[PDB]
């Protein structure tokens, strides 16, 4: 069984120690030839690499070009997010822009959103650089923390980015997982990932790409999109609800085998009319996923306690019937 973390503390020390001394090259990628980008990536990596849990996010400045590009994408998205987009995005985005300060003139930092989520939703942000493995990111995603980056795309290609950047997640990921239901949804994916074999690691990752990154929802009669990648690109949004790509009902097992493509638009999509349907299907998927154990999340200490003995089930119990005891007061004092 591959080693997996149990507390947020070792999510920091070892996954940054196993990933020490590793810069991003991306030379052959579009752009990334300007020296200023390399200097920025150095500063971006330095803040991310030596960051420790519990510490506030070190605020990073933003010069003229990034905000000027941030003008372009942010202005284009609000005029188009009013259509084609999921309903939960709308009141969230309005809630984000009025409180957190999602505006064209001011580029948002990471501390303000990080404070904003755990105030309501419970997700923390975390800077990172280099090549994110599949296992390190799911371990973070398991603990109700979303791994993130603070640098943005290249000014040469503001319409699309070779790799997900800051604006990709603060506009595609962050608005989505601020939801009560999807956060519980997103957490379930991470929960099944604890100690899963490499073959299984691919499966839910494809599901994560096929549900969180590109997912369709059916509410108010019409179909809408809630994918992170869907709500992070301009041309994708036009293609997403267009009649060219093939759209089918979501299926955990089916989405775990179907392949992908890169640098091109996606022609395959999965739709879930309700996030309740979304949870309880990969819920059944995790049921058939064999493991020598299971995993329980403790929100009182933000840790993971392993489950290979019926005894380990015990120190979860008095908490479980605790509410069913505390439900007495609420359902006694009432009336």
């Amino acid at each position: 069984v591959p080693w997996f973390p149990r507390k947020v503390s070792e999510l920091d020390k070892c996954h940054h120690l196993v990933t020490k001394f590793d810069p991003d090259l991306d030379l052959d990628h579009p752009g990334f030839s300007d020296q200023v980008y390399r200097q920025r990536r150095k500063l971006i990596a330095e803040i991310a690499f030596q960051y420790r849990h519990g510490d506030p996010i070190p605020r990073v400045e933003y010069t003229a070009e990034e905000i000027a590009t941030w003008k372009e994408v942010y202005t284009t998205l609000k005029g188009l997010y009013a259509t084609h987009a999921c309903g939960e995005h709308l009141e969230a985005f309005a809630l984000l822009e009025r409180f957190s300060g999602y505006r064209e003139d001011n580029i948002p930092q990471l501390e303000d959103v990080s404070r904003f989520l755990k105030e309501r939703t419970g997700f923390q942000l975390r800077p990172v650089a280099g090549l994110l493995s599949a296992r390190d990111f799911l371990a973070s995603l398991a603990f109700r923390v979303f791994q993130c980056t603070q640098y943005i795309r290249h000014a040469s290609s503001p319409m699309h980015s070779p790799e997900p950047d800051c604006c990709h997640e603060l506009l595609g990921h962050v608005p989505m997982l601020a939801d009560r239901t999807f956060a519980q949804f997103s957490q379930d994916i991470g929960l099944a990932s604890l100690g899963a074999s490499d073959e299984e690691i691919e499966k839910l990752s494809t599901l994560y790409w096929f549900t969180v990154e590109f997912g369709l929802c059916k509410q108010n009669g019409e179909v809408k999109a809630y994918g992170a990648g869907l709500l992070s690109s301009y041309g994708e949004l036009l293609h997403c609800l267009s009649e060219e790509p093939e759209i089918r009902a979501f299926d955990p097992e089916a989405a775990a085998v179907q392949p992908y493509q890169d640098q091109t638009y996606q022609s395959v999509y999965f739709v879930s009319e309700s996030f309740s349907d979304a949870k309880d299907k990969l819920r059944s998927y995790a049921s058939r996923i064999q493991r020598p154990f299971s995993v329980k999340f403790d929100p009182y200490t933000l840790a993971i306690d392993v489950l290979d003995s019926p005894q380990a089930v015990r120190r979860s119990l008095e908490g479980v019937q605790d509410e069913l005891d505390t439900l007495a007061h609420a359902l006694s004092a009432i009336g």
Binding site: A134, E163, I201, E202, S205, T206, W209, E213, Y260, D262
Partner: peptide, 18 residues
């Protein structure tokens, strides 16, 4: 490209095993 990030896992994983 996260599927490719799954596709990067195993040859490095199995060649380490191999």
């Amino acid at each position: 490209s996260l599927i490719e990030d799954a596709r990067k896992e195993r040859e490095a994983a199995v060649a380490a095993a191999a």
